[PDB]
Design a binder for this molecule. Sequence first.
Ligand code: HEM
Ligand code: HEM
Ligand SMILES: C[C@H](O)[C@H](O)[C@H]1CNc2nc(N)[nH]c(=O)c2N1
Ligand SMILES: C[C@H](O)[C@H](O)[C@H]1CNc2nc(N)[nH]c(=O)c2N1
Ligand SMILES: NC(=[NH2+])n1cncn1
Ligand SMILES: NC(=[NH2+])n1cncn1
Ligand SMILES: [Zn+2]
Lengths: 416, 414
Amino acid sequence: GPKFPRVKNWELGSITYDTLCAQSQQDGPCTPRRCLGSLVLPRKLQTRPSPGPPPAEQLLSQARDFINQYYSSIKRSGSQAHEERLQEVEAEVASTGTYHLRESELVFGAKQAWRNAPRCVGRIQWGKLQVFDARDCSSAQEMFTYICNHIKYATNRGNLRSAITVFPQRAPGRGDFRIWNSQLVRYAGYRQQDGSVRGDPANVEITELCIQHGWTPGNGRFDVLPLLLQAPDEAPELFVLPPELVLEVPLEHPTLEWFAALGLRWYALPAVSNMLLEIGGLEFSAAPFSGWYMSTEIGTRNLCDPHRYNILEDVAVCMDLDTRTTSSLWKDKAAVEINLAVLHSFQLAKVTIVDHHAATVSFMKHLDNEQKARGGCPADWAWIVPPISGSLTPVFHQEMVNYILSPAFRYQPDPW
Amino acid sequence: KFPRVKNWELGSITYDTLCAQSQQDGPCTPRRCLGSLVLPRKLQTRPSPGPPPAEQLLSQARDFINQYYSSIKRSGSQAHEERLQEVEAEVASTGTYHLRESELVFGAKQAWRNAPRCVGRIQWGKLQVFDARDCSSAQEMFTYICNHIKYATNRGNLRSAITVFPQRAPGRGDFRIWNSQLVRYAGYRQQDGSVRGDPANVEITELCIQHGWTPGNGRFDVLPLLLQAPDEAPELFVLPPELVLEVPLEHPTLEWFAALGLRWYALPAVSNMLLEIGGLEFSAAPFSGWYMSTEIGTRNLCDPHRYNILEDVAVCMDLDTRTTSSLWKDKAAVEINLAVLHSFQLAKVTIVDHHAATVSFMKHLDNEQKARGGCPADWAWIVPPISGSLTPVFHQEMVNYILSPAFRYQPDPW
Ligand code: HEM
Ligand code: HEM
Ligand SMILES: C[C@H](O)[C@H](O)[C@H]1CNc2nc(N)[nH]c(=O)c2N1
Ligand SMILES: C[C@H](O)[C@H](O)[C@H]1CNc2nc(N)[nH]c(=O)c2N1
Ligand SMILES: NC(=[NH2+])n1cncn1
Ligand SMILES: NC(=[NH2+])n1cncn1
Ligand SMILES: [Zn+2]
């Protein structure tokens, strides 16, 4: 049969072959000897800081490959304009050590990066992305203006629009542009005396960093953190987001009237801000991107993880379930209502959100589209399958091939 | 070369050094991960018409023998050196060799222990091993299988067991159990392609009919076994109904659930996998333990390509099946799993829920970290099909690799 990975969907019995992986130019963490596909951060892509300028030879091949992707995408591969652009990139690297992207090339790359993200289940929206070019930004204060505009446009009063803001690329032996927070909107995590945590345990470090840098802490469970923005070779500066710009949703349950009394809530905009956007060898250390939430992110992970808000027991006690024995499935029941609450509240508030059923179904359509357009789609099964009701969704029954394609969104070391 | 393994719920870290002992290749490569694939594209168990390369076989045999003697703290003993010489002598002259019962017992347990997709390995040391290598006919296989079933079921107090039939031999056909499990519900293709019964057993149901079985017409008709002795057409045997314990499903508070006429068998006994110990291959070695509720309540009854009872239960619950956002599927799935647990508990039949099961697996990982420096595990299979992140294993990174002794998949005999 075909010399490529055979992929099967066990619900439908259909078969496809992934030929796109043949295009991967970067190795992942697995080997014939052992699979490391379940590791969150194996030492692979990891964009560790490589200060001193990169091998001109290394950068050039990556740049040539990307330009080739660009001209292919506009169907002008082999054309005079293609060969001229290639010549220009080569000359520019040959004299300055690096190069720069045209406006339309950046837009294309940003979208491809999303398209290539193995861990994103909402890629069926990949072609619709608002790319804000902020490569002219020259100060931490300006970074804050850019970011506030991003939030304003993306939040769009509840009718969320996908967007990305791209700040200046990393440059020859110079400081990077960095957003210290993992997300534009994060709730504080206060370490208590007895060692417990008030707020979100996931943000204890960044919370303490904001304090060390002059932020006057609050003492609530849902205090929105300020941003620590860093311009080249400067210490980070602190910026507080205007309350009116951070849209939140109080959580209530459609039938359990007491749930609202829990005083739980979540923000509307999921904007990742600590990932590195790599295009043609070029590295954009600060390129925050946002879309909209899939309910399980909030309802299952953020609110129910043992190491996060951990509200499962509280909600079970309220629905007066038997939390003394596992077989009563009290965890499963509470989790379902909590997710239902998230969906209901977002709908009430007219804020964009998608449930794990709709989300996965659409991702299946995306897989079908991509099979035809590229011959495959890199996907991380453990991340694509929802944290609750796994086999009740179609993706659970779909084998997936994971691999690295560029452009890409990579993880990078914390700047501190 | 040793992978750092992290648990994101606790922050703890360990290093898997056991994977270095893997001598068999998986489906992954540095260019792409195929960890989510169910079956191997090549890691199969190709035919055995010829003798396995003596060099290859001997090395695997010595490895195993070494493992065995280490297990009884008699490494480098007189017995150890002599057993190795016997093995070498037998292979050199016959091209194969045979295991001593105690070694077979040790190999079976290690095979279970190394099964990456098994979440119940904390029970790996408690396994009743029935030696059936003295089998020469299908009829004899049926008697062995019947005894295995009576022992394992034990009136509802399930006990893990495995029966090992004669190893494969060069140029001679394999002993095989055609059925994937000793207990399976028939799947009858009716009208417009719809299926009455279990859709997963359409093919085997069809084979049984072709070989003389007079089919039923129900949704839970226990199938007969098609047992095959070397180079002979398979034979048909009907299991004494008294031997097949079943559990009628009812719900603790939902009165009408019982009216759905649902039920499931107590004994999960896989019968189509191959047991490989020290290079030797046992094509027929059925093994059984007990069910983890999700296998029945989520996969078997709710898979769209299985009994697919989700909408029916939802409608009975009067849920809004008009939209996905009402989470009607999630809600019905939880009650169905509840019904399974309640029912099995009521009938006094062993079963373990997915929370209790995964917690014990975590303890197993630790026991193994200390005992062997690691534990091969398939994350996708270990994490339950519902409430994934609600269990501890979801937050546990895992390293997957092939260790021997081992249970492997093999071609269907037809
Ligand atoms: C339009 C709606 C979108 C939805 C519903 C969506 C949903 C998701 C979900 C469920 C995750 C996993 C989150 C987690 O478990 O922490 C995720 C990951 C990711 N998404 Fe999307 N996504 C969307 C838009 C975007 C956009 C606009 C981009 C980029 C332009 C993007 C890039 C990624 C990447 C790189 C990851 C991996 C993050 C990580 O590794 O931590 N997504 N997305
Ligand atoms: C004592 C109770 C046991 C429990 C609770 C248990 C549970 C499980 C579960 C949930 C699976 C996945 C099944 C599926 O989704 O199809 C599984 C797979 C497996 N178990 Fe166990 N198990 C137990 C005993 C055993 C025993 C006695 C052996 C063998 C000696 C064993 C060998 C395996 C193997 C080889 C697999 C993978 C089978 C496949 O690839 O289809 N298990 N087990
Ligand atoms: C250990 C395991 O890889 C880890 O908990 C993964 C599993 N799947 C996930 N899936 C998503 N979407 N997000 C995550 O953070 C994770 N964490
Ligand atoms: C395609 C995917 O690998 C497949 O559906 C797997 C996922 N996890 C599983 N986990 C268990 N326990 N059993 C299964 O059959 C599967 N099927
Ligand atoms: N849901 C999510 N985690 N994200 C959406 N856009 C960027 N991340
Ligand atoms: N629960 C299960 N799937 N099994 C137990 N023993 C063999 N299979
Ligand atoms: Zn892998």
